[PDB]
Design an enzyme around this catalytic site. Structure first.
Site, PDB file in Angstrom:
ATOM      1  CE  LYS A  70      -3.087   4.961   0.454  1.00  0.00           C
ATOM      2  NZ  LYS A  70      -4.542   4.896   0.095  1.00  0.00           N
ATOM      3  CB  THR A  82      -4.019   3.623  -4.187  1.00  0.00           C
ATOM      4  OG1 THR A  82      -4.856   4.715  -4.623  1.00  0.00           O
ATOM      5  CG2 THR A  82      -2.569   3.997  -4.437  1.00  0.00           C
ATOM      6  CG  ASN A 101      -0.840   4.550   3.497  1.00  0.00           C
ATOM      7  OD1 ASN A 101      -1.793   5.217   3.932  1.00  0.00           O
ATOM      8  ND2 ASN A 101      -1.004   3.390   2.897  1.00  0.00           N
ATOM      9  CG  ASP A 111      -3.413   1.707   5.711  1.00  0.00           C
ATOM     10  OD1 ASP A 111      -3.747   0.551   6.127  1.00  0.00           O
ATOM     11  OD2 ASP A 111      -4.083   2.362   4.888  1.00  0.00           O
ATOM     12  CG  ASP A 140      -2.222   0.864   0.905  1.00  0.00           C
ATOM     13  OD1 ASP A 140      -2.545   1.098  -0.268  1.00  0.00           O
ATOM     14  OD2 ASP A 140      -2.882   1.243   1.893  1.00  0.00           O
TER      15      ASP A 140
HETATM   16  N1  LIG Z   1      -3.065   5.451  10.116  1.00  0.00           N
HETATM   17  C1  LIG Z   1      -2.875   6.687  10.718  1.00  0.00           C
HETATM   18  C2  LIG Z   1      -3.600   7.805  10.323  1.00  0.00           C
HETATM   19  C3  LIG Z   1      -3.389   9.035  10.920  1.00  0.00           C
HETATM   20  C4  LIG Z   1      -2.426   9.173  11.913  1.00  0.00           C
HETATM   21  C5  LIG Z   1      -1.704   8.064  12.342  1.00  0.00           C
HETATM   22  C6  LIG Z   1      -0.672   8.208  13.410  1.00  0.00           C
HETATM   23  O1  LIG Z   1      -0.095   7.110  13.790  1.00  0.00           O
HETATM   24  O2  LIG Z   1      -0.373   9.308  13.860  1.00  0.00           O
HETATM   25  C7  LIG Z   1      -1.922   6.826  11.752  1.00  0.00           C
END
Ligand SMILES: Nc1cccc(C(=O)O)c1
Length: 338
Positions: free
Chosen positions: A156, A189, A159, A172, A154
């Site tokens: 991108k 994506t 993330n 993610d 994933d």
């Molecule tokens: N997956 C996701 C989304 C937003 C913030 C965080 C974070 O660990 O700060 C993680």
């Protein structure tokens, strides 16, 4: 040998946690809800504060019934089992996990600098040195994950979070999976899908190296290489074997990207006999001190602006919805191992 021994220990430590996963290490009423940081079809991420310690965390909340409806059971179990077992400087850490009658919860380190995506879109494009600093962290992270037989699937800009030192934290793991050999699920994506995913083949870790090529291109150009308005047109461009490069790209960058964005997976950098070293030894990375990056001794190109560990200003605004917990247990069987 120093790298071989590092990776052997990394795998040993991963496997011990993989074989005996942690479970049920917190509960919801130990936290205060602060703000929704992101939302999706089956879950959300919220900034929370631990009531006793005062520490802030990002809590990913997955609705079990929606996970089942959207056929994401295995993916969510993968995500948690992997996150509780990995440990690397450029991966967001899982601090606690638990479930209740309605939802699954993963409580992660909060990274107040926000998504790379926001910073990239605000500045337009990164200079090659800036793109290279982030790219090196992804290369090392994929070297680590692949040594554990993990595919990330994933990559991108959304993330990749930017921490207080200006380093990347990957989040993610919803599509990450332990794979020895091939796997088949259509996921990712559109702009980042490798051709073998689009063509419904059994594919392997080489898809991560394709996606790295897409990311490097997007960081250095400001837009992804196969951009088109409709997904069908994106996919046609991806499989075509053609890519156009901005004139401002260096020759070294173009050469690296031709080898990462290689349609034939058997010819793609990262998937040849020399593995990751074809990437690490490429001229575009000649200035990169790989150990210094790993040790976080390089000064970052950019330090995100934020006021403290509770500042949400680098994330965007969403409608605030309830975290409801049913009086009856939902989908207990499906999520027994979580
Ligand atoms: N997956 C996701 C989304 C937003 C913030 C965080 C974070 O660990 O700060 C993680």
């Amino acid at each position: 040998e120093s790298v071989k021994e590092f990776l052997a220990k990394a795998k040993e430590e991963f496997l011990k946690k993989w074989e005996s996963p942690s479970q049920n290490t917190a509960q919801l009423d130990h936290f205060d809800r602060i703000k929704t940081l992101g939302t999706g079809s089956f879950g959300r991420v919220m900034l929370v504060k631990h009531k006793e310690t005062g520490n802030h965390y990002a809590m990913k909340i997955l609705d079990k019934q929606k996970v089942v409806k959207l056929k994401q059971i295995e993916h969510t179990l993968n995500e948690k089992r992997i996150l509780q077992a990995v440990n690397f400087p450029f991966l967001v850490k899982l601090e606690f996990s638990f479930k209740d009658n309605s939802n699954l919860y993963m409580v992660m380190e909060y990274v107040p600098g926000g998504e790379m995506f926001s910073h990239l879109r605000r500045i337009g494009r990164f200079s090659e040195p800036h793109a290279r600093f982030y790219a090196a962290q992804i290369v090392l992270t994929f070297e680590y994950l692949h040594s554990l037989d993990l595919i990330y699937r994933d990559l991108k800009p959304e993330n990749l979070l930017i921490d207080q030192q200006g380093y990347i934290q990957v989040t993610d793991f919803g599509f990450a999976k332990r794979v020895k050999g091939r796997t088949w699920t259509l996921c990712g994506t559109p702009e980042y899908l490798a051709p073998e995913i689009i063509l419904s083949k059994g594919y392997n870790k080489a898809v991560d190296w394709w996606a790295l090529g897409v990311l490097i291109y997007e960081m250095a150009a400001g837009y992804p290489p196969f951009f088109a308005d409709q997904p069908i047109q994106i996919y046609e461009k991806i499989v075509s074997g053609k890519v156009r490069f901005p004139s401002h790209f260096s020759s070294d960058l173009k050469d690296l990207l031709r080898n990462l964005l290689q349609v034939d997976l058997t010819k793609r950098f990262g998937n040849l006999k020399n593995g990751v070293n074809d990437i690490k030894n490429h001229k575009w990375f000649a200035t990169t001190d790989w150990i210094a990056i790993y040790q976080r001794k390089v000064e970052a190109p950019f330090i995100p602006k934020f006021k403290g560990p509770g500042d949400t200003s680098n994330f965007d605004d969403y409608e605030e919805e309830e975290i409801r917990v049913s009086i009856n247990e939902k989908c207990g069987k499906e999520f027994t191992e979580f």
